[PDB]
Amino acid sequence: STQREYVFIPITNSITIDVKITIGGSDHITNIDERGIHNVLVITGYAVDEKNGRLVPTLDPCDYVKGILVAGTPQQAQSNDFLTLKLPANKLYLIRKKGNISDDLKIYIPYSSPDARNSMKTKPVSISDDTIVNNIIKEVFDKIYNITQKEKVKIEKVKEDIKELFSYYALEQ
Amino acid sequence: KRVLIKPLEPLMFRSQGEFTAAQSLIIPRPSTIAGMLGYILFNKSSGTGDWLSDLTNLLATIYGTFIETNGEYLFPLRMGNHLALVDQQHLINLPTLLEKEYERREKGIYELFYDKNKLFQIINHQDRIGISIDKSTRTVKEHYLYSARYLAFKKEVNYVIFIDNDAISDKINGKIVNFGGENRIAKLEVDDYKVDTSIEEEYYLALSPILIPDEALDNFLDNISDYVAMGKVDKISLGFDIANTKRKEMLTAILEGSIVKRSIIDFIKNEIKNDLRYRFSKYEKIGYNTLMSLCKLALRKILS
Amino acid sequence: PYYAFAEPFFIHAITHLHVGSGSSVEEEIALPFQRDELGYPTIYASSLKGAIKSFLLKEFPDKRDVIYKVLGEDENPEEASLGTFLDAILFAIPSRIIEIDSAKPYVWVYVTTYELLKKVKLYLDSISQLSNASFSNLKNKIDTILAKEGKNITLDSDLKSAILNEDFYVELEALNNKIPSIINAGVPLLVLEDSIGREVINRSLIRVRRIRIDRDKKVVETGGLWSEEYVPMKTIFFSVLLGKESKESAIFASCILRNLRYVILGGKETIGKGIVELRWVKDVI
Amino acid sequence: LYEEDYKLALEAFKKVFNALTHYGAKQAFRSRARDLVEEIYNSGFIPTFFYIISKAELNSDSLDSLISLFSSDNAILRGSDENVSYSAYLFIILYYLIKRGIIEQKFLIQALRCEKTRLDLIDKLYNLAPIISAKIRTYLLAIKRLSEALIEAR
Amino acid sequence: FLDYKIIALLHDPPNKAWVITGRAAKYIINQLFGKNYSEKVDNADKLASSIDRYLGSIVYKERSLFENRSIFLKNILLSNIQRDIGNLFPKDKSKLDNLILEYKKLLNVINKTNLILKYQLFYLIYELVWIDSKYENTPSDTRNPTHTIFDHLYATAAMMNWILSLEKEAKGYLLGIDTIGVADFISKGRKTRDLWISSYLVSALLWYVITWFIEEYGPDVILFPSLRFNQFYAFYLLEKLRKEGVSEDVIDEIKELITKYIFNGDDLFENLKIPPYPIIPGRITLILPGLIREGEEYKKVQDDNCFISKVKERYNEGWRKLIEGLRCYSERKREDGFWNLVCRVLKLTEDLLQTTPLNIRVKQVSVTEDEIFNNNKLRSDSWKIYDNKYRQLVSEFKKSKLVKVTPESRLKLFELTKFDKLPQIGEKSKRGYEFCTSCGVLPAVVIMPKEDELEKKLIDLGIARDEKDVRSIKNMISPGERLCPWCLVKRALGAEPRLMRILLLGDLYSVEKIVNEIVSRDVKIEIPSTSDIASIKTFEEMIEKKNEICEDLKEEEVCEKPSESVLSMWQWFNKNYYNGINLTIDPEEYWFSEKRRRYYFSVFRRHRITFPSPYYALVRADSDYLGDLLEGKLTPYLAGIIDSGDYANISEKKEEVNKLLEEYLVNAGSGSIVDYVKTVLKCIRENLNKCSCAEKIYSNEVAKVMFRVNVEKANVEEEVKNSLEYFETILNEGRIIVTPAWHVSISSALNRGLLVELELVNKHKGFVIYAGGDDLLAMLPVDEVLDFIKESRRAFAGFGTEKLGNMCLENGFVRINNAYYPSLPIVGRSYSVIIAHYADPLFFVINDSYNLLEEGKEIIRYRVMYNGEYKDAKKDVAIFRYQGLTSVIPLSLKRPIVSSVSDFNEIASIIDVILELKKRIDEGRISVSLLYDYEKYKHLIVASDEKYLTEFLVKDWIKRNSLRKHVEFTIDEKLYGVRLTIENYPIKIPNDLISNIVYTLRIIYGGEK
């Protein structure tokens, strides 16, 4: 059948080597149609590890980070430190639900061990530096979606929706 | 710090005209709480035709109202013509449930407003009819038959507010006050309580009516989905001023118990010139624009 | 504070009482008594205020100014009342008792529940810190009683068992201590579990049918049939009078309420309903 | 509250209504149901109970039929419609006392078998008379209404 | 380009059944070019209805492979109702062009420069002229009759808008409209005048915004409600030709053709100049083409703001037009009283009335060539987008519905109430401002005193300037009343209900032309009150006992004469007004007074006539699960067992859902197809799985392709697979895949049921405050509710013995004199009845009429028969309520509602028992003490868990208080164990049916003293 995997957008450039996938299938969970992002995933209870970016599972309901699922599996360098599960296609809190789900979907997750030796108090942070995502599209959003520079005539449109939508939490440690 | 208003008896918070009986609100408006507190702190020398100026001078920033039943905290939640009291443990997954799928949406929300609804376990609506008698005939004086639907409490209930200033929180302790409408009574008690402030989440709960400056009314309304996920928007009067014996004002407001999206904050922050900025800062000072996070008990004002 | 002092008092029904409410066909009784919120009989604060105001205006036609400005002037409404009554809470209703192999054979007892005592303790707590209204012993008794909630409790420790209102068998136990009697009546007080207590109390109310008869032929007039509920003699309600600091309140509380023992409450006074004795809890206990 | 008593009365009436095989015995029991509750609440429970047992012809065969009713539901009461109707009403009262924990079922079944303990049953019932009369009125009136509704007027 | 569907609409005539397989293109048209089919009409057809993939796409356009020689027509909702065509036919070819000469009596007299006017001219009469030619409604398909042919024609032409929108390059739209607070708007009232005009406002405001659509995109653009039987579209076409230019002896072939099939009663639309009944719902959805004209030419645009803003601005423009017309008419009657004041207030508070008291939600989903065309023709799953887009629309609507904005929040009332700069006529309020007694929410602008003198105190306040307008205002505005701007605008529209024509004709006349048309004629319209209804049978009595009891009242103007022409929308008023008792008097002064009461009653004592009871019966009816009925969910079938939430994991009710559509699919076909599909069903647990059973039933297909060969390819390779996976779609994700034809069929049924519902309610003494068919809000007298409900609930399905207006009443069908039309038999329908005093504030009455039904369709559960076991059905409850009582009567006691022709007689049977008992109560056979005695018998009958024992108990309770010791009133036994569950709501509803019957009779007899 099909499967997917998770990518995140921190205030860090820790997404360079994550997976070996560009398309995987032929159609995608998250879409690119001229009014910003679509089918964007929000996962609560996972906070980021900015340097060598990971996400630690906390015990917080409002500690939330957003991410994107595209068909593939990371690097064949995992299955010891990540997680992965196959949900019945509707266990996903994803903003701007547009396409009909496939009644099933397998998705991996970049996981971090709790590191139960530190007094971790997180902090939520907002995305800044319009340049940062204006070239994270150079990093992944064109690597994962070749559509960049080909369809969307309003680049700053997606720039500003990434400004306004995405904001997440950090371990700050 | 924290103020518990414990009604000694059924209460009456008259709303929406008097014209079977006149209905009572569930949660008293912040103007009522501010007016009771100013009634305590009053001095008959600061009079001015601006009721809210003389009221902001008498006290400090007051944070919105919710329900403490028996240690539990209940909070208002409305879907549109549907008020309910829920414990915050059912507000957690609410934003997830908001843009969740359709049939799951109705399943969850109607399970919340009906079975998880703790309103009727707490609140009874008690119609009271009174008359007036002329002291010589001993028969009902003509035209004096009034009715009102009081708000009776099945179990002991408190209204919870948070006040910033701690000086007044000394001469507020253990005061018996004339809380509400037709001469009903409640006791105030003050206790030190710890509450976070100003968290940057996406979905807040309007603990109090969020006012709208009557300038961005068309702006705020013609695209309503951008600011409130669920709740009610209504024109409300601001009450009745004791000094000049008139109604106060009428403003469109987001009724308490509504779910607001983070965007609303910036919106309100961009549509207020200095004049009405000061006006609505006073309004928030007496307690209108209070937000709480669906995460935990953490409050914040919109402007302040 | 603007409620500087409080006067807790008891309302002893000398005759049967009928403080009416909205007559309607949903309660198998045309003219029901005022129900509180739990189905218990209550007296609304407005009824108390109006009745006592009328009584005082009649009995002291010179203190009329004090009475007007403490309990609210009618012809010049511009000034709030310096006095305020809380709703009268049912404190004890008399019940017929059949003793079962006990020491003192009684024919009637006072019956309470734990809901009613919780409300009485609410009223008492909310006024105890007024620096003159103290009555520590009363709320201490109420708290000793409330600790034992769940069990049908008797205060005078001789019953151990009884049949109430000819219909309800209940087993009673003492309070592990004498708990000096709340009221000075020589009748035991029974604090019952709420579920059975509501039944005993609702059975202690008087439901009467009344008719209108044509004077000439002693036949009943067409349609002249209805029912009313009364609250029996000996019934006790509990209420509080709250007063602000103003000086007419002082003279009111001084010589208007000291000479105030009996009062007419409720309606149907030509049927002799409504004679009430007010016991102030500032001299008794 | 005594609202389960209507269910109790329905099943007890079904028992004694099948046990009385002669229709004249049904009508006799009907008259008993309409007379004995009046008499219980006008003369007292103890006088009326003595009157019932005096008229019941409590011999060991009839008592065994009673116990079988308490258990079987195939049992049958015999013996002179007047006597059998008084014994059916005795069973009505006893069935209530059993199903309401006023009288322990084993002690009762022992009483309806031996002879020394029948006086013990009567003495115990004597000490429980206020409680029984207070508690059984709803049940007995339900029995009266059922007998008026189901057994044809003679 | 569009406006040419006349080629596509009649691509199949109303003689299709007699064509296929002998029975001895077709008649393309006598006045137009030939019909074109490359990708327009048949790509519309194979996506419009449900057959074209059900029975196979090639097997459909074959239309003879499993052919049937007979012509049956099953019900769209109930496959198990067989209806034949008998033997009657449309007259043969030697007389065919007979009726074509009627296709040119109104199409050629009106010059055809206007194509849109030809369509809209022909769109209403294509149905009505053929039911004059007695064509008996040949079904859409012969091999699978599941729609009447017109529900296919209008459907293919309505989604032809999408077809043409996709013709050019890329666009296509679904538009929906939902007014925001109809329930609360309606509640705002005082006089039953406000109620009727406010419901008419909710209807007509919404009608205005689509008069634009029907003139610009022509008719048929509307999906809901279908404009095939509309009391508004007929009136609009009529008064539109009245403008276009008619002669009074040329077009009446349409006027009187409408007069009978719509507006069955004599009180016509052309005698009031307004449709007398507000019938338009508050929710209307549309399908739209991507092209738009700004004059003579179309041009498309991609912005999704294309239609929402136009709808909103037109909706506001309608309110502007109507308030300016009110200003004009009030200026005209500057002296005629109560209109000086309307003019004065419309002059004072002008910028307040700039905003409409009703808001609307408007959502919009679009569609592209992608997922509907592959390269230049269709692709797979193309029948799967219309339901997809419609579910998108419904989900966006119900997502928005989570937020309720009140219209009062639109107004800028801050500076008005912060300072004393609020204009107040009458009592200058001491408290800044007062609230209006008709909304309670807004500040009042007109404040009339209660009374101290009542003649100068309303002049010393300046609400009137002369002594002659004192009566003129005191008649329309009662003492102690305080009106807001909106309340006064409504009461003004009520004093003269013909101004709404401005908002009704829909950008066809000028406001001044119509205000000048109706400013000349003085037609005193009358609208009943609640006091009028609470005296109906009084009036009815005085008509017979004319003057034998009118001797003290001859000079009291109650036995006077009819004045000139006072005619009303209330059909009872319009056949009892001239008999000799003036019906325009208001009983609040005569017998419902407090001074003249001891007099009229004293006159009636010596004349021994019934004293009027101060009680009417507000009757509201709401359908059950209509939304997901239109969205394909099977919940309106299994009301109570399956629910809306059950459609989040619909596989979980596999046993109870697969049991249903199983017999709904195969029982819908006719011919050998009935055996073709009844094997591919349940083909996952067959020992055969999906796409594996593909060529496991192949025989019945291949054994038929070699039966009548005309198509080039007898090789299938795809035809079994697409059909089987089609059914797999509809059952795995179990629904009935909704198509345009489905929507049009159910909407047409809604309209036909609407008009027959009107016929029923005025067959009683009812006064229709609103009737959407699916819903209803009337005001009947208390003594006519039961027979109404029993009739109504049955009529809604189609059941009863009378030719109602001019159409028959079958079992699940309505026949318009020869033509069988489908109905809603499966559709449950709840009711609510409130016995109200005339003096009760109408606000509370309307509000709890709404709340009772809304929350009781949810809370109430009752033991329902289902396959022998007993579930808890939810809806189908007729709730009753007195001042303190309440009662519930189930209406179906079975799930599904109907599956056999006999099952119809079970519909609304409990209330029928209530009728047959109410009859014998007052006929002097059973006492009323039957209702006091019952509390003695109730506990035993409740606790009785056995049939014969309860039989004897109820029989004894009847006998013990019978007046004649022989009455035999056999209460049925199914009424014996049915319980009523009521969870988490503080009402007191008895949990057993007989107690509810007793309480129903108690409530109804309470409002008779």
Ligand SMILES: Nc1ncnc2c1ncn2[C@@H]1O[C@H](COP(=O)(O)OP(=O)(O)NP(=O)(O)O)[C@@H](O)[C@H]1O
């Ligand atoms: N013209 C009309 N006059 C009166 N009532 C109407 C009219 N059209 C529809 N209704 C009823 O008004 C109600 C509308 O349902 P609903 O969807 O709640 O709209 P609402 O009542 O305005 N609230 P909302 O759902 O937010 O739109 C239903 O009871 C309809 O039957």
Ligand SMILES: Nc1ncnc2c1ncn2[C@@H]1O[C@H](COP(=O)(O)OP(=O)(O)NP(=O)(O)O)[C@@H](O)[C@H]1O
């Ligand atoms: N898709 C629709 N098409 C037409 N009218 C609709 C649609 N959905 C809702 N309505 C109407 O809008 C109102 C919706 O309120 P309501 O009647 O509670 O919804 P419902 O679908 O009927 N579910 P129910 O509570 O069983 O009636 C009713 O007046 C319906 O007739």
Ligand SMILES: [Mn+2]
């Ligand atoms: Mn609506």
Ligand SMILES: [Mn+2]
């Ligand atoms: Mn509905």
Ligand SMILES: [Zn+2]
């Ligand atoms: Zn108004």
